[PDB]
Amino acid sequence: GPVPSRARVYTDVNTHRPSEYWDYESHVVEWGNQDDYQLVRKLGRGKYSEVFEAINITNNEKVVVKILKPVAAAKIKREIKILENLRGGPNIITLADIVKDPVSRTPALVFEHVNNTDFKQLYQTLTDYDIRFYMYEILKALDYCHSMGIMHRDVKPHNVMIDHEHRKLRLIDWGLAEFYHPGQEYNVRVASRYFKGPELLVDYQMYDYSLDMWSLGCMLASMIFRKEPFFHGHDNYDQLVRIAKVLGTEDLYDYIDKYNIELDPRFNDILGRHSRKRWERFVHSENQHLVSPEALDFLDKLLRYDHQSRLTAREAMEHPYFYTVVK
Numbered sequence: 001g002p003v004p005s006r007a008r009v010y011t012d013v014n015t016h017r018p019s020e021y022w023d024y025e026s027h028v029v030e031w032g033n034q035d036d037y038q039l040v041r042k043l044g045r046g047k048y049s050e051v052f053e054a055i056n057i058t059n060n061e062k063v064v065v066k067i068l069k070p071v072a073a074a075k076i077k078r079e080i081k082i083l084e085n086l087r088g089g090p091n092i093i094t095l096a097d098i099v100k101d102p103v104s105r106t107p108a109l110v111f112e113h114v115n116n117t118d119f120k121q122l123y124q125t126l127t128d129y130d131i132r133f134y135m136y137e138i139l140k141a142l143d144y145c146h147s148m149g150i151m152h153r154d155v156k157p158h159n160v161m162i163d164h165e166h167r168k169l170r171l172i173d174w175g176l177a178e179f180y181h182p183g184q185e186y187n188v189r190v191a192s193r194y195f196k197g198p199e200l201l202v203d204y205q206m207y208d209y210s211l212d213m214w215s216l217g218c219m220l221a222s223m224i225f226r227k228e229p230f231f232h233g234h235d236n237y238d239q240l241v242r243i244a245k246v247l248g249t250e251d252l253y254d255y256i257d258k259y260n261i262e263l264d265p266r267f268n269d270i271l272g273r274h275s276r277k278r279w280e281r282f283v284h285s286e287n288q289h290l291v292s293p294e295a296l297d298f299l300d301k302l303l304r305y306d307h308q309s310r311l312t313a314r315e316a317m318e319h320p321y322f323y324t325v326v327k
């Protein structure tokens with residue numbers, strides 16, 4: 001069967017913490033007062049929650065309330081425990097309260113409000129300096145949660161909020177995050193299509209923090225090359241084909257050979273044979289202002305099939321691409 005894998009960093013952080021840290025089902029939720037929050041307007045709804053802008057009437061501060069749908073309310077202790085474990089960490093969204101919604105009769109998570117800059121505006125306006133600055137800020141959040149024994153598993157632009165005026169970044173939506181335990185087989189149905197790592201796409205379950213580093217690479221490639229998304233799959237199968245057209249099929253087959261993976265036979269008729277393309281293939285007049293040799297080298301070290309080969313968040317922070325960023 002498949003060859004096992006473990007992370008190369010923060011491998012046993014969970015074994016060395018009291019069980020209460022990661023045994024989220026044993027956690028006793030401390031409930032706040034729902035009357036402290038007045039709903040103002042609905043911001044959105046997904047298959048898992050409804051999100052509202054609200055006011056905390058005890059301090060007249062804006063907050064965001066995420067009301068869990070009856071379906072997603074089951075794994076709520078995992079999201080709660082992760083948010084409480086990470087609270088106060090670098091660029092981690094703050095969970096302000098947990099209340100029982102009077103209408104849905106489900107848990108409602110109350111978060112720090114971010115006056116975030118529009119995501120399309122961020123995509124279209126961030127300069128070369130800004131991309132480096134904000135990539136360094138998201139790396140601080142990722143290294144912190146990985147060092148705390150947690151994988152986010154849903155890194156994408158909409159989950160990395162930026163309030164551009166205050167040069168403030170927050171990593172949000174921890175509903176898919178999980179505790180990393182060496183040897184654990186995880187569900188591959190995580191992350192959003194364009195940000196799924198090859199490990200998910202080839203159905204390799206023994207993945208780790210390094211999944212988040214692939215997703216971060218996908219964000220970086222889209223930003224510097226002005227291509228949204230960078231790997232534009234029609235579905236989860238075509239997603240792997242899109243990747244293979246850039247990274248090549250030989251390194252893909254070496255990856256599945258190494259891990260002794262049984263690749264879905266549906267790929268035999270669609271992967272084809274592709275060589276790796278040099279990153280300069282994607283440079284053009286409209287993105288050259290965002291591209292540098294250091295950006296290409298950094299990207300090259302994130303977007304690797306072999307999850308064990310990718311830079312860790314702490315190694316990424318050491319890269320020359322960040323030397324120009326004021327620290």
Ligand SMILES: Nc1ncnc2c1ncn2[C@@H]1O[C@H](COP(=O)(O)OP(=O)(O)OP(=O)(O)O)[C@@H](O)[C@H]1O
Nearest residue numbers: 043044045046051064111112113114115116158172
């Ligand atoms: N802490 C927060 N501060 C301010 N706005 C927030 C906060 N958390 C979430 N939001 C916003 O709430 C809105 C609704 O949330 P939701 O997750 O449904 O949307 P989304 O991010 O556009 O979804 P998707 O994951 O499909 O891209 C979004 O505009 C999101 O940016």
Ligand SMILES: N#CCc1n[nH]c2cc(Cl)c(Br)cc12
Nearest residue numbers: 122123131134135138157160
């Ligand atoms: N794509 C896109 C826009 C965008 N949304 N959120 C971001 C976070 C960072 Cl770190 C960077 Br760089 C860019 C974005």
